């Protein structure tokens, strides 16, 4: 487009970013697929642990803090889940950390009780990993999924 | 068409090995995997280059516009 | 741009009177003394040294003027018009640190001359400056245009055969100063 009126329209009206929900039924059209779903089931598994080095590296590799999302001009991290015998973070903490670095700081963390596609039976006795729990912006239970 | 010079993956020279490989199968009556080994092709990368080469050039060469058939 | 014009003009224009020159020096030191008195406090505050382009611009012009016409600013006594001895030093040691942000070749020539005249001693401040450099910040997206603007002198010598000859009566070549 060749003049500022058309610019303004392409950036504010026909731009991708708004068009998350379809006007047909008002449901999502954008999401991740394939590798990214398989990856999520694995990264957010209870069996998933990361050392300080790995945890910090996953964070920085995906945040891109050198962007318009200077929600802070310093990356924030959580304390580890396991303190002793060895400092370890879980996968679910990587998610909490991501949200923590890209949601507004002057605003409380998201609260969600949801479910995913995988029945508890698949993880073992007593599992609750089918239940997706976000409390104050932290993923406290459940894996993340196509759902 | 003609033997490749290097193995696509290894980088290893393979183009000096075609004429001998044929002589191994022909004269020494070896099987293919024994002959490939004798020429030093260890990685399956490299064995593939000589094992599956088609010397199509020898067909192209039968049409020579510069001689009275 | 005007400040470059201003400085180049005073330096070069042969038919200028001692007092018209002192006039421009008196305007610049005056305007400069005020800047430092009213603004030095803003340096350790939030922003960059670019906030002060205009300061360096004027200080350049004045330094440049001093290069070409320092022999004039000594009155009969041997004292300096505009207290240039006492004045230059004050700016050089200020927080703006002019020596670092102005044209490199002028700041150098001013150093040489000023030191020679017992007017100011900049050479240690320069040393400190390009040491800190190897190891007061300004973007460089916009920092270059400034370095560009401070390099141009609209009355540096002419290269047109005739015009040059015609200008001679009205021009001071560096060799003359």
């Amino acid at each position: 487009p060749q003049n500022e009126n058309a610019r303004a329209e392409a950036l504010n009206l026909a731009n991708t970013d708004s068009q998350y929900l379809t006007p047909t039924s008002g449901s999502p059209v954008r999401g991740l697929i394939q590798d990214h779903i398989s990856a999520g089931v694995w990264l957010t598994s209870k069996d998933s642990f990361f050392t300080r080095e790995q945890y910090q590296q996953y964070i920085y590799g995906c945040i891109r803090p050198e962007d318009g999302h200077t929600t802070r001009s310093k990356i924030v991290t959580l304390p580890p889940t396991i303190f002793k015998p060895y400092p370890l973070w879980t996968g679910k903490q990587i998610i909490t950390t991501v949200l923590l670095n890209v949601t507004p700081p002057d605003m409380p963390g998201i609260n969600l009780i949801s479910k995913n596609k995988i029945k508890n039976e698949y993880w073992g006795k007593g599992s609750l990993e089918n239940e997706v729990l976000f409390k104050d912006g932290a993923l406290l239970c459940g894996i993340l999924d196509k759902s | 068409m003609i033997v490749p010079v290097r193995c696509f993956s290894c980088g290893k020279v393979v183009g000096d090995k075609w004429e001998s490989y044929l002589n191994l199968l022909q004269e020494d009556e070896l099987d293919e995997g024994t002959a490939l080994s004798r020429l030093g092709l260890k990685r399956y990368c490299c064995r593939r280059m000589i094992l599956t080469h088609v010397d199509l050039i020898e067909k192209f060469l039968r049409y020579n516009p510069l001689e009275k058939r | 741009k005007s400040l470059q014009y201003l400085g180049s003009y005073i330096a070069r224009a042969k038919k200028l009177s001692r007092t018209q020159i002192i006039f421009v020096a008196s305007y610049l030191t005056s305007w400069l003394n005020r800047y430092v008195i009213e603004r030095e406090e803003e340096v350790d505050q939030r922003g960059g040294m670019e906030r002060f382009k205009h300061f360096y611009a004027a200080f350049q012009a004045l330094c440049y003027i001093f290069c070409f016409r320092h022999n004039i600013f000594r009155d009969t006594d041997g004292n300096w018009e505009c207290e240039l001895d006492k004045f230059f030093q004050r700016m050089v040691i200020s927080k703006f640190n002019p020596l670092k942000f102005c044209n490199e070749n002028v700041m150098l020539m001013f150093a040489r001359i000023a030191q020679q005249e017992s007017v100011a001693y900049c050479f240690s401040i320069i040393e400190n400056n390009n040491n800190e450099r190897l190891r007061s910040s300004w973007s460089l997206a916009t920092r270059q245009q400034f370095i560009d603007l401070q390099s141009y002198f609209p009355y540096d010598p002419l290269f047109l055969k005739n015009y040059k000859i015609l200008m001679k009566e009205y021009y001071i070549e560096w060799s003359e100063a």
């Binding site: 598994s45 642990f49 304390p79 303190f83 002793k84 400092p87 006795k125 729990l133 | - | -």
Partner: protein, 131 residues
Amino acid sequence: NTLFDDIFQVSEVDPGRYNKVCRIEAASTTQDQCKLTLDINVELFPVAAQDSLTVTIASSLNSWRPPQAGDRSLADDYDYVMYGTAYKFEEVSKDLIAVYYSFGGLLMRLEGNYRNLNNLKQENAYLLIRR
């Protein structure tokens, strides 16, 4: 300060479908009504049935940074230490209560008498285990 401790005896150690984590079920030796469920990185802290584990929940240890020269804290007294959040409380009966903890996803459910678990709040907490 310390909010809860007890010696537990492990009933079951289920590896589920994982191979670094196991779900532990264990009962207290001191209270007939106090029982426990806990996910543990068993690669770092192996557990077998019939083991006896001392289990402590504490609010602090007397923000995180790698151990330095001569750091001393409550962690020194134990083998295995986790940091996490209390996220749910529930009435089980007129007498007994259960609190739910998450340690970056590894879940604990501690059930016991409402006087025996009086100090537990819905905050963050450290978990300390020693053999």
